[PDB]
Design a protein around this ligand. Sequence first.
Ligand SMILES: [K+]
Ligand SMILES: [K+]
Ligand SMILES: [K+]
Ligand SMILES: [Mg+2]
Ligand SMILES: [Mg+2]
Ligand SMILES: [Mg+2]
Ligand SMILES: [Mg+2]
Ligand SMILES: [Mg+2]
Ligand SMILES: [Mg+2]
Ligand SMILES: [Mg+2]
Ligand SMILES: [Mg+2]
Ligand SMILES: [Mg+2]
Ligand SMILES: [Mg+2]
Ligand SMILES: [Mg+2]
Lengths: 467, 232, 50, 53, 160, 75, 110, 128, 190
Amino acid sequence: ISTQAAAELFKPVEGDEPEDVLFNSLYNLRSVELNRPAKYNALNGSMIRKIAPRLLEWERSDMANVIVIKGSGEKAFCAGGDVAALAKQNAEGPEGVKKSVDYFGLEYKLNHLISTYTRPYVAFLDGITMGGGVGLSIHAPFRIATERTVFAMPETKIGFFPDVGASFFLPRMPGQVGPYLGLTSALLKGVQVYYAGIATHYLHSSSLPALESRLAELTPRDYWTIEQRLSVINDTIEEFSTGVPYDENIEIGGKIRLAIDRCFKYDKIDEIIAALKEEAAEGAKGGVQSWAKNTLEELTQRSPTSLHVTLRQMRLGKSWGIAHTFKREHQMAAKFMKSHDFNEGVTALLIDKGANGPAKWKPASLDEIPPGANISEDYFRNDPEVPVLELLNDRSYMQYPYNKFGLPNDYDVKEAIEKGNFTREKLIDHFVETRRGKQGVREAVSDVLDRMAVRSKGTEHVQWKKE
Amino acid sequence: QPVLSEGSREIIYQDVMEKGLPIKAVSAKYNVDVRRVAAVIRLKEIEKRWIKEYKPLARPYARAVMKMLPQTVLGGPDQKPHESINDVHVHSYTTQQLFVPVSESREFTREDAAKAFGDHILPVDKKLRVPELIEFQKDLLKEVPLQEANRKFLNATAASEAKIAEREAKRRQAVEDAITRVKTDRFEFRFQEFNAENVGHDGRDRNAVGWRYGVPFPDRKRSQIKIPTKVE
Amino acid sequence: GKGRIFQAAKVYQRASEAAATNIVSGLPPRNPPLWLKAIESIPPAEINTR
Amino acid sequence: ARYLANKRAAQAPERLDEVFTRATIRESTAKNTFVPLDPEAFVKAEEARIKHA
Amino acid sequence: GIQQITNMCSHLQNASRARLGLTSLPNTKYNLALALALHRAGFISSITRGGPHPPTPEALMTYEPEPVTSANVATRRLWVGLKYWNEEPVLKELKPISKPSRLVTASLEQLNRVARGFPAGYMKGLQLGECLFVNTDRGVLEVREAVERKVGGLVLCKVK
Amino acid sequence: AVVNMDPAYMAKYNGSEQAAGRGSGLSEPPAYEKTADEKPAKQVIANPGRKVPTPYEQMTFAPLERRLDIAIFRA
Amino acid sequence: RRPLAPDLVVCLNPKENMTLLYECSLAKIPTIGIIDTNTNPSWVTYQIPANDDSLRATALISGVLGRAGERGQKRRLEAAQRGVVTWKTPADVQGYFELASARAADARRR
Amino acid sequence: ATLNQVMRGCRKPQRARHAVSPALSSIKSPALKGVCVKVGITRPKKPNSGERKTARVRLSTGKVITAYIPGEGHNISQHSVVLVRGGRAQDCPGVRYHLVRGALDLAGVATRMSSRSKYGTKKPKKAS
Amino acid sequence: DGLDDKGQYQELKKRTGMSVRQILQLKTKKLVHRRVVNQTRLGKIASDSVMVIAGNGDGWLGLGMAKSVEASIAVEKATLLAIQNMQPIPRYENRTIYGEVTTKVSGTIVRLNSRPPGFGLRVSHRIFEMCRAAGIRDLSAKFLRSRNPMNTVKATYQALLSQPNPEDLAIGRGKKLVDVRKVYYGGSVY
RNA sequence: AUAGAUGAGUUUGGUGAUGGCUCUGAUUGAACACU
RNA sequence: GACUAAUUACGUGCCAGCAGUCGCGGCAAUACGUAAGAGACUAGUGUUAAUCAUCAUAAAUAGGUUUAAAGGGUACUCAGA
Ligand SMILES: [K+]
Ligand SMILES: [K+]
Ligand SMILES: [K+]
Ligand SMILES: [Mg+2]
Ligand SMILES: [Mg+2]
Ligand SMILES: [Mg+2]
Ligand SMILES: [Mg+2]
Ligand SMILES: [Mg+2]
Ligand SMILES: [Mg+2]
Ligand SMILES: [Mg+2]
Ligand SMILES: [Mg+2]
Ligand SMILES: [Mg+2]
Ligand SMILES: [Mg+2]
Ligand SMILES: [Mg+2]
């Protein structure tokens, strides 16, 4: 896409505020500050039409060597998207329903660009990050969390389905956490986002201004591979680490983590809830009864259609490509505008501000949906009316090229054991040495060895429990 | 540097005269400068005159001198091009050191470079003596058959020579329309017309017609050219 | 000026250029210092900026 | 012909690549040059008279 | 008045010579024009008008200044963010050309010649890195921005 | 002086790559790193033979070559 | 061969000895120093703002840098046992090899 | 100086420098004829020692100047019409002119072989 | 090969690390030759302060100064001291300097301008020796205030090391500094 | 009209400055001397 | 002699003389006068006078004034900037 084509595709449609996003350029650093603190920097049409030209333009030059996206306020980075407006437009006939589909087109176009960006992309998660704000960071190789970070996807509560590229991400995460975070719409605060795996680094909010100054000093050579450029930044972001809290323990770990892998491995919501009921039932061996009971209360308070549809793509999104995912999500989200749950949930929650009581999904509960009925299939059939989404480029892949910057997950610990003879204590030192003192590596690796590691041959060797 | 062999000069002569090929094509074919191709024809024409008038040529001197200079026989056995046919004069404006501050992501092209050097300057794409080559090379980038690429080249060059001849024809025909030839008993008076009001705004103009008033004879100045400057 | 011209912030720049080409024009430049590649991707921090 | 060309260049749109690669200067600073009279001037004077008294 | 631009040019030299991060300037319609030019050319970091104390550095661009009424116009001031790279200031010299004692004006034919390293009038050719700012009816443009717009006028300062 | 410019480069490229980077052109690794590398880097895009210096010094007595008597001696 | 020069100096009291740091910048050598509140930060390449008058902080900073070198030396030796040298012959010693072949070439012919 | 002080005429011409031969420089003449008034010997100053062959001459204008006689031996006496050219005997205060040797009455050195043009000596004509 | 039969380049052969045959291929010239004198208790003691430039012809130049009672020995000191002080000098298209430079050394100011190709070294005699030795071929210098032989060489040598770096100015301003001459000719015409 | 901007000798026991003098370039409606 | 391309011998001995500037000559003078050689221009070659430039050496473009030429004894103030 040339400058003229891009500039002509993102024309400043009437109503676009002039200073929605604030751009700045230092030496080697290009920044993008979402300037809408009143509404928690909520993404919308006007905001997306100002970022796409810049990102495309900054990708043609070799001067811009580091891209940084951040929020303007001190509470939120990008809390959701313009869900409220979509609902109104959806209630004005087909002409108004296609406007919403066009908005999702822009968002997916941007997310794909950020994911297939040819330059280092950093995102300061200094504040709550939900909905649209989850699409500007997850696909980046550097996602800096802070004390104020609050991660969640409260989209299944409004009838919608997590879709800012989540289908590519969540599936390909360690364990069944990705579905859990989507279906349950859990709330992760502070360092828990770092341990979970969403974020790559964890710095204090006060040390972000001094990080930008350093990122500007970095001047890479034109012959350095994309890997080298990322390595330099990764080592630079670790220079400002103040250390994870001393008291806060891994939230989703140990028992709770094991319970997630035992209740989020099936392909039917009915089976999943059936498993949770067992854990909730007193005397369960797991010891997660409290968590189990609490989880059910939240699962029985969301649109049943979204649950079925959401879980459906978690199993199908593990094989799609990033480019194919966005194209499908567009058609997928286009049918949600015509659905009744979405138009109802949004209006009854955000619009009404919770007045008139709880929302009223078209199916009252999962029990109403008979077993032999599959409602998921209908959405996963692109219609000819909605044209296929046209991305800004052709770059694609099956798995994230450089998503190794974060804390070691099960995939890393597993690989290490299958290529070495480390012990219980000697294996931890291996990862602490390779990462040279990354905060939380000793704790994270220890947790992995407390869930999928057995003392098969004593202290001499360590093997996985699966076998 | 090598010199066109005797047999080579004839090949260039026959191509232009017998086959009536455009000079630009013959130059691009054998990698010979258009200024040299035109000279070989002029020199060869004089030879035809000498042979037609039964004049003795300097064959003993020609053969002896040709063995002391490197030669480039054209045709089948062509190893290297005779010379560069794309040399562009280094204009004085283009020799300056200019670092123009532009946007970090700007696509600065030769067109923009010409405008930075000056306002009336052209890019090197228009200063070539055979500009049709660029158009011919653009066809090879579009996977156009070589045979058709040469066809377009010939037509382009051939069409260009027609325009040049037309302009030259109109010019000479328009220059003879201003001259009135009045034959007399002894001579033929040639009265040329011209606008007597084109003397600039202060009377000083280079292309004016008349002996200037207010100038003393400069015969006493140093380095005063008093020799013919051109032979027509 | 009782001080002296310190250039500790430009050791890489100066050294990198000196190791670009050889002093004997028409030869491959000899191997650079061992430290030139170590601090290649670690530029110094900005100083003296109130 | 020369007058239109010159008038067309002085009223031409800024280059696109120079619009997408410039730090954003807030409008409040770069365009609010007008200095209006204080709307609360009358209340302040009436309140300042008592204080001085 | 042109005396303001001269004071502004001299001040930015001293501020950069002292290696300061921020710099204050009297809030005037003229100073702002030249400041935007320096920013549009890449010499200064940011421009924000505020009170006698500098705004919150962390939120410089997010800083929302209050309206400039006749009740506080006397305390308003322009805060410029100086730029330094490679242990060297980016705004080293700001020699002025049009002083209060004489307003030097240049034509389009002279600016074209000065923008290629050739003297013309009371000016000198521009060398590598140097830059000239001319105040015209189209604002305080750069010599190369005024050449593409085919204008001329008052020459403010030569930026090296 | 003159400069040779082949039409091949003219067609493909329009001189935009000569400004990539910071204006002077995309930098390339030094000569001491290349020898260690097994595979050589891609060649830079430019006209053929566009780095040799032109001998201006050896043109002082060019005006004498226009003399009619010197031109005969050179023939 | 002429004597060696340090490829990196780690000073713990730049304020005291400025003659060493000046020779490093004069000979194009990087340096590391503990810059206090009254020490000129332009003397060393990499500053470490801290208290230099404390024998307890100096031991900590030096210890951390010591472990850095130790960890670095470990990787180098681990890469040398795999036939992967992380450094090429210096220019000085490199010249000797060239001269060695020249002297050896004579023996081949003669 | 300020632009105002220059409108008032603060840029005046530099103070003139005295010429080497004022009598000639004044009227822009390369030489002048004069009747010799006295033929004497002037003495050099601090560094130099010897006896210079000067001559008090009364130029056509009327000024009475002291010239210098270059060469070995002269042929002029009282009331001798001699041609005076510019110059100066550096080590002789008051002598700021020379005398052409091939002049009206002053005869060139007859025993001069080198630099005859400077002393007005015809070629020996040994063979011719 | 018996070239150094005086023991003068043996020490220099270690610092710079190159054969004597390559040391003798450098362009050396004595620019300044003063006759200084110091009044002491034993009478006047005259010395010969000399300045020698050791050039490469392809971008490297070095300035050395030394004094001694003997003029011959003073020249060897500056030569050895100048061959080891060689530094790379940036030069646009290997023929001229970048832009313009103005260096001041205690009352001696030198202004060097970058001239187009085919301009020649229209400079003074001392600058010519340095430009001819460093590898420059087109330059236009000027002594604005004073013409001290020594400071003239120090100021102009310090000016060739203070040329504006077009790449540092670009990263500083965030703007490209494109050489129009290179884009126009599709390369660098040396 | 885009190639056009240049120095040298001489103050001091010595160095760096200030500041003149002189030479280096071009020329004449020129004179003179030797030709 | 150096500036300034180009050397020895003899004669003279602060004498005779050369000299644009610095200077040379007091008994083995590369500087004076002869001889030879060398460097260079050439039907012209030198010298004298004058002009521009050198000279930012009256500086509008474009200077400077603590110790080097040069801040008024002072500041209220008309004109004027
Ligand atoms: K924030
Ligand atoms: K003297
Ligand atoms: K007085
Ligand atoms: Mg201390
Ligand atoms: Mg005297
Ligand atoms: Mg003789
Ligand atoms: Mg002076
Ligand atoms: Mg004294
Ligand atoms: Mg000589
Ligand atoms: Mg004589
Ligand atoms: Mg003699
Ligand atoms: Mg004649
Ligand atoms: Mg006083
Ligand atoms: Mg008085």
